[PDB]
Design a protein around this ligand. Sequence first.
Ligand SMILES: *[C@@H]1O[C@H](CO)[C@@H](O[C@@H]2O[C@H](CO)[C@@H](O[C@@H]3O[C@H](CO[C@H]4O[C@H](CO[C@H]5O[C@H](CO)[C@@H](O)[C@H](O)[C@@H]5O[C@H]5O[C@H](CO)[C@@H](O)[C@H](O)[C@@H]5O)[C@@H](O)[C@H](O[C@H]5O[C@H](CO)[C@@H](O)[C@H](O)[C@@H]5O[C@H]5O[C@H](CO)[C@@H](O)[C@H](O)[C@@H]5O)[C@@H]4O)[C@@H](O)[C@H](O[C@H]4O[C@H](CO)[C@@H](O)[C@H](O)[C@@H]4O[C@H]4O[C@H](CO)[C@@H](O)[C@H](O)[C@@H]4O[C@H]4O[C@H](CO)[C@@H](O)[C@H](O)[C@@H]4O)[C@@H]3O)[C@H](O)[C@H]2NC(C)=O)[C@H](O)[C@H]1NC(C)=O
Ligand SMILES: *[C@@H]1O[C@H](CO)[C@@H](O[C@@H]2O[C@H](CO)[C@@H](O[C@@H]3O[C@H](CO[C@H]4O[C@H](CO)[C@@H](O)[C@H](O)[C@@H]4O)[C@@H](O)[C@H](O[C@H]4O[C@H](CO)[C@@H](O)[C@H](O)[C@@H]4O[C@H]4O[C@H](CO)[C@@H](O)[C@H](O)[C@@H]4O)[C@@H]3O)[C@H](O)[C@H]2NC(C)=O)[C@H](O)[C@H]1NC(C)=O
Ligand SMILES: *[C@@H]1O[C@H](CO)[C@@H](O[C@@H]2O[C@H](CO)[C@@H](O[C@@H]3O[C@H](CO[C@H]4O[C@H](CO)[C@@H](O)[C@H](O)[C@@H]4O)[C@@H](O)[C@H](O[C@H]4O[C@H](CO)[C@@H](O)[C@H](O)[C@@H]4O)[C@@H]3O)[C@H](O)[C@H]2NC(C)=O)[C@H](O)[C@H]1NC(C)=O
Lengths: 52, 110, 126, 104, 52
Amino acid sequence: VKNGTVEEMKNCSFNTTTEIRDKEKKEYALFYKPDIVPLSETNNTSEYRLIN
Amino acid sequence: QSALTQPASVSGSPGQSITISCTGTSYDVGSYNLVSWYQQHPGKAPKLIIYEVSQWPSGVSKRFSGSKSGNTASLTISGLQAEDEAHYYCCSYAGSSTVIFGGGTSLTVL
Amino acid sequence: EVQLVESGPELKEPGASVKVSCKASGYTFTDYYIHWVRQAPGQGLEWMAWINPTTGRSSFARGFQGRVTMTRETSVSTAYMELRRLRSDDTAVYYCAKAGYIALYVDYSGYPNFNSWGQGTLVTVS
Amino acid sequence: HGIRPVVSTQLLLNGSLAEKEIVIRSENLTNNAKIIIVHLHTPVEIVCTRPNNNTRKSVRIGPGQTFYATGDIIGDIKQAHCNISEEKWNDTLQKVGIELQKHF
Amino acid sequence: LVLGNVTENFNMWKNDMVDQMHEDIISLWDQSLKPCVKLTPLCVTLICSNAT
Ligand SMILES: *[C@@H]1O[C@H](CO)[C@@H](O[C@@H]2O[C@H](CO)[C@@H](O[C@@H]3O[C@H](CO[C@H]4O[C@H](CO[C@H]5O[C@H](CO)[C@@H](O)[C@H](O)[C@@H]5O[C@H]5O[C@H](CO)[C@@H](O)[C@H](O)[C@@H]5O)[C@@H](O)[C@H](O[C@H]5O[C@H](CO)[C@@H](O)[C@H](O)[C@@H]5O[C@H]5O[C@H](CO)[C@@H](O)[C@H](O)[C@@H]5O)[C@@H]4O)[C@@H](O)[C@H](O[C@H]4O[C@H](CO)[C@@H](O)[C@H](O)[C@@H]4O[C@H]4O[C@H](CO)[C@@H](O)[C@H](O)[C@@H]4O[C@H]4O[C@H](CO)[C@@H](O)[C@H](O)[C@@H]4O)[C@@H]3O)[C@H](O)[C@H]2NC(C)=O)[C@H](O)[C@H]1NC(C)=O
Ligand SMILES: *[C@@H]1O[C@H](CO)[C@@H](O[C@@H]2O[C@H](CO)[C@@H](O[C@@H]3O[C@H](CO[C@H]4O[C@H](CO)[C@@H](O)[C@H](O)[C@@H]4O)[C@@H](O)[C@H](O[C@H]4O[C@H](CO)[C@@H](O)[C@H](O)[C@@H]4O[C@H]4O[C@H](CO)[C@@H](O)[C@H](O)[C@@H]4O)[C@@H]3O)[C@H](O)[C@H]2NC(C)=O)[C@H](O)[C@H]1NC(C)=O
Ligand SMILES: *[C@@H]1O[C@H](CO)[C@@H](O[C@@H]2O[C@H](CO)[C@@H](O[C@@H]3O[C@H](CO[C@H]4O[C@H](CO)[C@@H](O)[C@H](O)[C@@H]4O)[C@@H](O)[C@H](O[C@H]4O[C@H](CO)[C@@H](O)[C@H](O)[C@@H]4O)[C@@H]3O)[C@H](O)[C@H]2NC(C)=O)[C@H](O)[C@H]1NC(C)=O
C-alpha cells in the first residue's frame, strides 16, 4: 500500500504436510520481513522463502 | 439493541440533577476507559460531550460531568434547564477494534 | 472552517450498493481518521467502520461482515464507503465524522470521540 | 547474589547499579578494538512497546505437533518503538563524558 | 529380621515409594521404546473394506 507509506508486514501462504502424509493442504500466515527472502533465480517477486 | 444498555427515558423538573446511566460488560467497558457521550436535537447530527470519560471538549460548562465504575458509566445532567430536552447517547470502545452505542434516551419535558 | 460534506439522499432497491460519499475541508485530511455511523429515522446510533486515510486499511462492524467496501482519496480530500447487499431494514441516515488523530506510534483507531460531523444523508429502500 | 541472565547487545537491560558513581572498564584503553564497558549509578528508564495487536494462530504440522504463526492484525498497524527521556539521557551521557575525560 | 520391642508409625497413602516407582517406570518404559521405528509413515489415507 502506497509504496512504503506504512509500517508494513508481509502476508504469505504455503502448503503444509497435514495430519495425513500425502493429502497436503493450503494454509495462510504472516511473517515480519527479515524472515522472508526472494527465491527466484530471476527478478521475479512472486515466490518467497523463509530466511532459513 | 446491542449489548451496551441505556435507560429509555428519564424526566425531572427544572433545577434538578439527573444521572443518565450506561451499562456494558467486563469485556468492553469494565476493562477500558474510553467512554463518550453525544447530544442530539431531532433533525440534526448529534454533538459530542465527554470525549474521554471525564474530560471536556468545548465551552459546555460543568453541567454534564461523567463517571464510571466497573461495567457502569454515567452522565450527570445537572442544573437542569428545560431547553436541554434532547436525545442523549452512550458509546464506548469495545473488542476487535469495534465501537458500540448505547440505546439512547429521552430527557424531561416537565 | 471545518465542514464535512456528503452526497445527496438516494432511493434504492433491495440488494443494491449505496455509494455514500464524504468530502472534508478545514483540516489536514491525512491527519485524522474519518469515522462512519448509522442512524435509522427516529432511532439510535449504530457504528460502521474505520478507514486510515493515509494507509487505506480498515475494519468494520461484524453485523455487516457480508460485504462492505472502502476507499480513500488523498489528492481529493474525500473518502467513500459502500454498504452492499442492501436490506429494507438497512434504510437509515448515514454520517461521516472526524475521529481521533492518527498517531505515528499509538493505535488511535478505536477512540470513539469524534468532534465534527457531516450534514447527514439517507438511503430509502423500496 | 543473584545476577540477571538477560540477553542484550548495546544496552544492559534490567541490570544492577554502581554503588557510588559512573565507572568505566577496559582491558587496556590504548587498544581501540577492545570493548569498553560503562556502568551507571543513575538508572535511565527505557520503555518499549509493539502496539500492533498481533493475534495468535495454530497451524498443525504432520502428526500431532502444532506450529504457531501470526494471524490477522486486529486494529490499525503502528511502528514498534522504544522511548527514553531526553533530559535523563543527556545528563547521563554528559556524566559518562566526564568519566571518559578522567582517562582522556 | 524380627525386632523385639519396636513401635513405628505407618502412613501408607503418603508413602513416597509409589512416586519413586511411578516416575521410575515412566522413565524406564519411555526409554525402552527409543530404538524402534517411530511409525510416522502410516498416517496415510486408508481406502478399505467391502460390506460387513
Ligand atoms: C513513546 O513516545 C512517543 C513520542 O515519540 C509517544 O507518542 C505520542 O503519544 C502521545 C500520547 O498518546 C500522542 O499525543 C497525541 O497527539 C495528538 C496530536 O498532537 C499535536 O496536534 C494537536 C492538534 O493540533 C491542531 O489543533 C491545535 C489546537 O489544539 C491547533 O492549534 C493546531 O494548529 C492544529 O490545527 C489543526 O487544524 C489546522 C487547520 O489549518 C491544520 O493545519 C493542522 O495540521 C491541524 O490539523 C495539538 O492539539 C497537540 O498539542 C496538544 O498537546 C500539547 C501537549 O500536551 C499541549 O501543550 C497543547 O496545548 C495541545 O493541548 C491539547 O489538550 C487540551 C486539553 O488539555 C485540549 O483542550 C487541546 O485542544 C489540545 O487537544 C499537538 O500539537 C493530539 O491530538 C492527541 O490529543 C487528543 O487526543 C487524545 C485521545 O483521545 C485526547 O486524550 C486529548 O485530550 C486530545 O483530544 C482532543 O483532540 C481530539 C482529536 O485530536 C478530539 O477528538 C478531542 O475531543 C479533543 O478535542 C479538543 O481539542 C481540539 C483540538 O485539539 C478542539 O478542537 C476541541 O474543541 C477540544 O478542545 C494526543 O495528545 C502523540 O501524538 C504521539 N506522538 C506522535 C508523533 O504521534 C508514545 O506515546 C510513547 N510511548 C508510550 C508507550 O507512551
Ligand atoms: C493473507 O493472505 C491469505 C491468502 O494468501 C488470505 O486468506 C485467504 O483469503 C481469501 C480471500 O479473502 C479467501 O478466499 C475466500 O474464498 C471463499 C470461497 O470458498 C470456496 O472454497 C470453499 C472450500 O472448498 C468452499 O466450501 C466454498 O463453498 C467456496 O467454493 C469466499 O467465500 C471468501 O469471500 C467472502 O468474503 C468476501 C468479503 O471479504 C465477500 O465479498 C465474498 O462474497 C465472500 O462472502 C460471501 O460468502 C460468505 C460465505 O463464505 C457468505 O456468508 C457471505 O454472505 C457472502 O455471500 C474468500 O474470497 C481464502 O479462504 C483465505 N484463505 C483461507 C485458508 O481461508 C488472508 O485473508 C490474508 N490475511 C491478511 C491479514 O491479509
Ligand atoms: C487485541 O487482540 C485480542 C486478540 O485478538 C482481542 O481479544 C478479544 O477481545 C475481545 C474484547 O475483550 C473479546 O471479545 C469477546 O469475544 C467473545 C468470544 O467468545 C469466545 O471467547 C471467550 C473467551 O475465551 C469464551 O468465553 C467464549 O465461550 C468463546 O469461546 C464474544 O462472545 C463477545 O461478544 C459478545 O459480547 C458483547 C458484549 O461484550 C456483545 O455486544 C456481542 O454482541 C457478543 O454477544 C466479545 O466480543 C474476545 O473474546 C477476545 N479474544 C481473545 C482470543 O482474547 C482484544 O480484544 C484486542 N484488543 C482490542 C482493544 O480489541
